[PDB]
Design a protein around this nucleic acid. Structure first.
Ligand SMILES: [Mg+2]
Ligand SMILES: [Mg+2]
Ligand SMILES: [Mg+2]
Length: 106
RNA sequence: GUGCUCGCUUCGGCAGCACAUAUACUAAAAUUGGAACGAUACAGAGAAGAUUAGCAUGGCCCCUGCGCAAGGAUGACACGCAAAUUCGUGAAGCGUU
């Protein structure tokens, strides 16, 4: 059982260290980024997860499920306007992926 | 500061002229922080039984070396509920239109 936010920050320190270490070794391996971003979105620290998805798109911009997870985080967390920007950037960079257009018009 | 001054003009002072033209991380300091690989306790070599030569791979880990040699335990690390977009069959019971 964790008490006041010193111990919560210690938990977060351990988890962030674990994920950043997995990112250091694998470097690519897109699931590592997705797990770390899902963990950040579960704790409503979604600016961290914006950073993680943007770093993952710096690694691999052509991976379509990564764009999908980033945009579904921003849709899910009621950030209509961020997600809308993401879909515009997604359909601009990867225009022959029809997934992006269907989900944005939906 | 020196010298020339047919300068006042004594050998005292002054006047003019010429030449000479810009050092310094400005400290004898006040401060300000970070390191060592030594002890002192816990700790003990990778490869699916045991004993083990090693050569790599990658980087927000470096050390010895002049080294684009070669060593450092194969120098160490690496050991992970390793789940990424995206579903459907058939029968039975209950309630509903
Ligand atoms: Mg060697
Ligand atoms: Mg050996
Ligand atoms: Mg090695």
């Amino acid at each position: 059982k964790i008490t006041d936010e010193e111990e919560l920050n210690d938990y977060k320190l351990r988890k962030r260290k674990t994920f950043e270490d997995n990112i250091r070794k694998n470097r690519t391996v897109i699931s590592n980024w997705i797990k770390y971003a899902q963990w950040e979105e579960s704790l409503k620290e979604i600016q961290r997860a914006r950073s993680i998805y943007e770093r993952a798109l710096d690694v691999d911009y052509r991976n379509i499920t990564l764009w999908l997870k980033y945009a579904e985080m921003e849709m899910k967390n009621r950030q209509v306007n961020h997600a809308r920007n993401i879909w515009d950037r997604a359909i601009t960079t990867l225009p022959r992926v029809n997934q992006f257009w269907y989900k944005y018009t939906y």
